[PDB]
């Protein structure tokens, strides 16, 4: 642990977007994106 | 070799995508993704 933040994570992940022409993020990303709203739907408050 | 840190994991992740031409993520990733919303759909204690 030391200097680890979203900063570096963003840089490499961002390059990934153009690296695969958004083809990857458009297929698996979309499906997992839908899964993200479902997974957090179980663990949430304020209804 | 490698470890269990997000930093190293990201670098390998980032390269893996072009290696399989996004074919793997689009398929196995999606199936695993829709499983992520189901696995956490049960273990929700507001963590």
From Swiss-Prot, chains A, B:
GO CC terms in record: cytosol; plasma membrane; TAT protein transport complex
Location (main, coarse): membrane
Disruption phenotype: Disruption of tatA affects the correct localization of multiple enzymes whose precursors bear twin arginine transfer peptides. Export is completely blocked when both tatA and tatE are inactivated.
Expression induction: Constitutively expressed. TatA is the most highly expressed of the tat genes.
Membrane topology per record: Single-pass membrane protein
Localization in the cell: Cell inner membrane
Source superkingdom: Bacteria
UniProt keywords, alphabetically: Cell inner membrane, Cell membrane, Membrane, Protein transport, Translocation, Transmembrane, Transmembrane helix, Transport
TM region positions: 1-21
GO MF annotations, alphabetized: identical protein binding; lipid binding; protein transmembrane transporter activity; proton motive force dependent protein transmembrane transporter activity
Biological process, per Gene Ontology: intracellular protein transmembrane transport; protein transport by the Tat complex
Similarity-based family: Belongs to the TatA/E family.
Role played: Part of the twin-arginine translocation (Tat) system that transports large folded proteins containing a characteristic twin-arginine motif in their signal peptide across membranes. TatA could form the protein-conducting channel of the Tat system.
Leftover remarks: TatA forms a transmembrane channel with a lid structure on the cytoplasmic side. The number of TatA protomers can vary so that the channel can adopt different diameters to accommodate substrates of various sizes. This enables TatA to pack tightly around substrate and prevents ion leakage during transport.
Quaternary structure (record): The Tat system comprises two distinct complexes: a TatABC complex, containing multiple copies of TatA, TatB and TatC subunits, and a separate TatA complex, containing only TatA subunits. Substrates initially bind to the TatABC complex, which probably triggers association of the separate TatA complex to form the active translocon. A complex containing only TatA and TatB has also been identified. It could be either an assembly intermediate or a disassembly intermediate generated during translocation activity.
Protein name: Sec-independent protein translocase protein TatA
Lineage: Bacteria, Pseudomonadati, Pseudomonadota, Gammaproteobacteria, Enterobacterales
Residues of the full protein shown: 1 to 47 of 89
């Amino acid at each position: 642990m030391g200097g680890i933040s979203i900063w570096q994570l963003l840089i490499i992940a961002v390059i990934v977007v153009l690296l695969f022409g958004t083809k990857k993020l458009g297929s698996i990303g979309s499906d997992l994106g839908a899964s993200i709203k479902g997974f957090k739907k179980a663990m949430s408050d304020d209804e």
